Design a protein around this ligand. Sequence first.
Ligand SMILES: CCCCCCCCCCCCCC(=O)OC[C@H](COP(=O)(O)OCCN)OC(=O)CCCCCCCCCCCCC
Lengths: 306, 306, 44, 44, 41, 41, 37, 37, 34, 34
Amino acid sequence: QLHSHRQSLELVNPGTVENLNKEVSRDVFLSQYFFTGLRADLNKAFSNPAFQTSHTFSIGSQALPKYAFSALFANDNLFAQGNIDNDLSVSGRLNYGWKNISKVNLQISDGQPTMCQLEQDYQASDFSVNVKTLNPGEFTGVAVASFLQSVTPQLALGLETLYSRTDGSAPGDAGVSYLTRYVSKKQDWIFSGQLQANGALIASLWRKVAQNVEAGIETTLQAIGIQPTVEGSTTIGAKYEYRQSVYRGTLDSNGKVACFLERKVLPTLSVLFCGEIDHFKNDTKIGCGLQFETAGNQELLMLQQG
Amino acid sequence: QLHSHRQSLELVNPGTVENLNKEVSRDVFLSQYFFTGLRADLNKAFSNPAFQTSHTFSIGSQALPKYAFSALFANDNLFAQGNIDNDLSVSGRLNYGWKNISKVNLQISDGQPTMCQLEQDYQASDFSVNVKTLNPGEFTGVAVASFLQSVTPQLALGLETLYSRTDGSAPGDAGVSYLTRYVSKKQDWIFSGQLQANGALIASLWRKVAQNVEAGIETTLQAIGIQPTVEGSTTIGAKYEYRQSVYRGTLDSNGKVACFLERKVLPTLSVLFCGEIDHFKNDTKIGCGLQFETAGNQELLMLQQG
Amino acid sequence: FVRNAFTKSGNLAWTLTTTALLLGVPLSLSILAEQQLIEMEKTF
Amino acid sequence: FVRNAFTKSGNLAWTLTTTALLLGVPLSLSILAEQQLIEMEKTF
Amino acid sequence: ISKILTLTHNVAHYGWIPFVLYLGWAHTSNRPNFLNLLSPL
Amino acid sequence: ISKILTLTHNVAHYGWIPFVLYLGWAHTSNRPNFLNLLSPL
Amino acid sequence: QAFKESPLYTIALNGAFFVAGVAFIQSPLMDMLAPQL
Amino acid sequence: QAFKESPLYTIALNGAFFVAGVAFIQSPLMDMLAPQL
Amino acid sequence: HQEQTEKTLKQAAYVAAFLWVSPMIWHLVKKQWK
Amino acid sequence: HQEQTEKTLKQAAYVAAFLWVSPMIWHLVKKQWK
Ligand SMILES: CCCCCCCCCCCCCC(=O)OC[C@H](COP(=O)(O)OCCN)OC(=O)CCCCCCCCCCCCC
């Protein structure tokens, strides 16, 4: 009676909840590329269904293993991985995306017993749904759902819940959040937003300047009468892509700078460098190292030069 | 009666006592080029009697000031310097080499009162003499003499004394040493040697390979019945000079490696890098930074490009 | 006074020039790596 | 035994390949910086 | 009887990464034998 | 009377580096004024 | 220092940094930093 | 370990490292590491 | 303890709020066009 | 203390050894040619 009036002129679909803030936090801010010591990883590929085999060495880095074998395999619809390190710890991932894909992320350690997951997705041209559990009379563990859909051709907003219960005979809690995302008129500044549980909130944007220059701001405010304890941190970045170079670098509040250069001096070899100055304690961290690849098939290496 | 028989066919003169082991320890072994944090010094020159003016910044380096002004001036026979750093500490040097040159090296600190020196030299075509005192009924301080001369056209050997007296009413000691140096037949491997006080001894050599490759070994043995405590360290280096690159790098006993690259990517700008792995404690130090120069005269900068 | 009105504004000239040597010099090396390539392939 | 005859000879393959990546790779970058120059000025 | 719920988790502790190599060993031109666990070429 | 032996050492504490600049200020073409205590050019 | 210890001090600090910062992005001044060659 | 704690252990160690090391320098093997181009 | 007796209705009101709003925000495009 | 009495002859033997050897090694070229 009222469905077909608006579902013919509209309904572009938004991205998932994971890719809400992807275009700023994991693209122009280097907070996951950084390291401290020296590291030099190398990987042979002989792929079409691909294949890799990566090793990794590291020293004096405080968060890295001193060895890490790997593998993967990915045809038109599958995925796999594997990651064993120096003493013993195994990982693994799967994808079976026939539109509802369905991941599994197992994680075995030794001091901590066993981590497991499960996931789901659905993209039906106007909305997205993420369903995720954790390790489970016995309804135990964490279970997270979500929802996100678009009501105008530029705006979209939804929310997500959770349900955490541990400790056996314990009832368990249930938080809530609210999400939002605005897109510009012609492929430009994308204002995101967030309001999670316990008061914290995120804000960001991403201006696409002329050819290869970006920007981005981020802001968090995380909060017996000593409990109101707020904090803040506003960061500003950029990224200068080129042919055979990539440069990004941020600076923020409470005193820090950072830089990350990657200069590929061969067709198939590249170096990098990353360093940071603190301006309160006046102490610094410097990390450098290389990364290169080769081929193992008898003719694949003939088809990267010319 | 016997002087003129041999002083007509011979008597090339050797180098000074400071340049005895210069061609290995201060040329192909990087033990004085190394640092730890970041540092970036820069210097304008407007020289013919030269002139420079160098600044220096550093951070997180444990042996460097966070600022250091400088100057120098050197015509056909003179020298000067100057070095003031962040809080206050002044240095200075002089040379007045009319063949007997005569240095003065003053050194003012604040926690430690005042350092002073004096020097001398003499090179009379078959022998060299170094005379050096330190800060002085009042015959106090340190006084060091030496002697070195050559008896065959390839070999030379001499010795040096000292006399250290402090503590006011205290007699004072006097050590001794022995020195030696052998040169190859046609401009090649130079075996040096030393035997200083308290048992320690040095040995080295320096093979000039084809065009720009060197080598070098070094060995020290420094030594209530717990007093015999010897130690040792044998190091092996090399150096690969090129046009617009310089590379050297050593490795030794008791577990260490080192490297030092300098790659001048401009006519008038250069970067560098130096890092070291320990293989007992398994911990590492990485230092990097740049160094470049410019000009201040209105036409000197026009005469470095072309 | 002299021992306050200089060092409280002398340290400010440090932090604005160990910053502009850290975020500006890796950028300046990356320009020349694309500057010389656009003219080497302009010759051919 | 297994837990001694491998790890006492597994760690030896580490130290001979974090050494040859530290003293060999800065040398290999410096060869190419003189390798490509001797042929660019061979063309002219 | 409960050990099989824990013995299942100790199967993936040693027998998962060797499964991934067997998959893509067949999805090639099926040449290589032991070069895959090797760094140079 | 002994202070002049210590007051001499406190003359070089503040008046030695400015002496070096005055020497080479004359041994040039005698142009510059204050560019020497400056980093860019 | 009578209000620097207050909790409302920071939520006025970072909120003031957002407004001038977002004006710096949407500006022709930020266009200048992109090199034209 | 009856002689590894002795003081004469190291002065035989480093002295043995000198002799094989100095033979490695004066050798045609060390000539090979110089690249001919 | 009567805390765990009333906590089950503390929690059940939380998911019942989500049961209203996600069907509510399912169709704002069908009413934002005034 | 008789330590400082004999230390002056402990030290005087040290420089007297240098007084022999530097004139000794002054002229080994006049005798190494056998
Ligand atoms: C407070 C003030 C501080 C100021 C800080 C300023 C620091 C600036 C430092 C800049 C360094 C940037 C690094 C870089 O970009 O490398 C460039 C250079 C090669 O670049 P080219 O221009 O020579 O390429 C020519 C094209 N054929 O490559 C090099 O120069 C050498 C780099 C070599 C890296 C070697 C990696 C070692 C791997 C170790 C392996 C460890 C394994 C355990």
